[PDB]
Symmetry: C2
Subunit: 349 residues, 2 copies
Amino acid sequence: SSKMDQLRPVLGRAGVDALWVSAPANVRWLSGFTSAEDGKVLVSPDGATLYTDARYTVQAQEESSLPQYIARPPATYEHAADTVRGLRVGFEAESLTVAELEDLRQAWPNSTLVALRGTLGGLRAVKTPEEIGAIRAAQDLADRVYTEVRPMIRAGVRELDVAVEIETRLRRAGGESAFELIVASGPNGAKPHGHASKRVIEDGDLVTIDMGARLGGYNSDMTRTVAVGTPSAEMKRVYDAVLEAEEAAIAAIRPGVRAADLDKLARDLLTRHGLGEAFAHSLGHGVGLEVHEGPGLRGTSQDVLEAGMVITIEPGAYLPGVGGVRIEDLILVTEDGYEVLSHSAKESV
Amino acid sequence: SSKMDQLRPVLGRAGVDALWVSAPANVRWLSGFTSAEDGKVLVSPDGATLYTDARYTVQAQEESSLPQYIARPPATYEHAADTVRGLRVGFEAESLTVAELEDLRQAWPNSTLVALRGTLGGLRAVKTPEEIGAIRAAQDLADRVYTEVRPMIRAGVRELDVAVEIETRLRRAGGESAFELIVASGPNGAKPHGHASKRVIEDGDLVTIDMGARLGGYNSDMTRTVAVGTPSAEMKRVYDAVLEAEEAAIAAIRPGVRAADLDKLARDLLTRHGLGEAFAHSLGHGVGLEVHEGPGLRGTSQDVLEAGMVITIEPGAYLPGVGGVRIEDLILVTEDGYEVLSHSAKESV
Ligand SMILES: [Mn+2]
Ligand SMILES: [Mn+2]
Ligand code: NA
Ligand code: NA
């Protein structure tokens, strides 16, 4: 099915006649426009139109699968007004500011603006071959840079300086770091939400490297933990347990599997190995135009995996004050299983 | 005056009894909390409270000048509800999403939520000595890195690689690039909104470097243009005109001067030197917790400079297809004039 034909039944079920698309990832998903922060799309009974300004005339003509109307706000949505007269027009309430909604309400007095909250969550969950190709290119860049930087990860090096080297090489390659880099050594390994500090890596530390590349608008995401010297017996057990959990959850991926059941498989396994008050509260997430997008692999998830989805699998176990381990791979769901896209080594410790 | 005593009369004039502060820069401005994306402040007739979750208990106790209530959303604003019963509660409509407003409306059914749009613009325009000190530290880092990287800017080097070197050194120093770096050489100098491309710098090019450092939460901002080899007679005239405009506008800074009149001084000067269909449409902006904040130096501005404000002055002239020049300094308004905070050399071409 075409993207528009995927979207329209979702709008029907949501009880709207039209949709003002303002989230940059959904503007780009629908239209192909790659400067989507400066575009908007109106989906309506008359079709679908990309709105952007005259700086982007040539670029939008070349990129957009949708006809274009060229103007700056507020001319864009004022021009759109007659198209939406008498209609229920959905908008993306998790994205749109109150001021932006006020602007639309003033411009469309003969329309009913309808807030959509979770409605479009996971709209982009299934990727086309072209999209998968772009994600592969991003992840291949991430793997190349990780493999280049890995030998620098040794005693005497600051976490921060490992992160700098990763960022440097991603940028020199024409990409960028997809999110704030995590290089978490020793007790810093036990803090999720920690990034890369000035802490110097020492012999006996595990080091967790959580990184991704954004390249051509698409993201990748992986996590590795490595040993510098010989870790404690305890941190080795932690590492082996998390690796066991990761490889077990990956091996259950197939069309039709419930995201929540993957989460349960990992938490049960960690619990059997003594780590069931220590683990991460989501197992993973979709990756695409955003680093974090649908589906979600929480215990409460109602998502069901299908072929073409790209997700992470990332069990984690944290021992506050001591250390912690995360290991994550980027996975493509296939017609009868999965394909691991992230190829960097997973080492023993 | 204290920050709260600055804010309360603004709220009075705006016709509200209370304010839900959600913009991270204003959460931090009022409270001192430095992880302000994960905090909110309620200003009310009962006082002012910082809301954040238990991950931040110790940090918020140490940092916050305001009492704290520790919880995750929605417990935070549900706990706040009885404080705002019967009140007109302002919220920051340019920041808050529609979904976030819906959440507050459900939690505060006996309150009236009042959208504030431009109300708090320039709230943070005047800086304290401590704030100025933080901005000086950021700009000093920017100057140090610019001076280190300047000699690499030569024929044969990609724009992108100059940007990478800047980013690398800012990050290694414990800061970061404040915004997407611009290194614009040759005809790329004529494109505002261009950043750093793979274009190789050549003899005869001007190169425009637009950069800032974020350090300890505060930003800096400057722009330099330099010559690689000998530029055309025309681009030299452009450079000299823009430098003349910049130094003229800076020299008019004092308490009481109108931001719009600074803009007029620069556009008149560029027009006298043949560049009055070529120039930038704002002369500059405040800098602080955000790179772009009040005041604004557009022709339509109603802002008036006062002592303690930190602003940029940045005339620009662009010759599409040929080249362009921007030059910018970061300026502190003083009791009877100004002080230039950005110290990097401004060269002849
Ligand atoms: Mn990761
Ligand atoms: Mn600048
Ligand atoms: Na991954
Ligand atoms: Na400046």
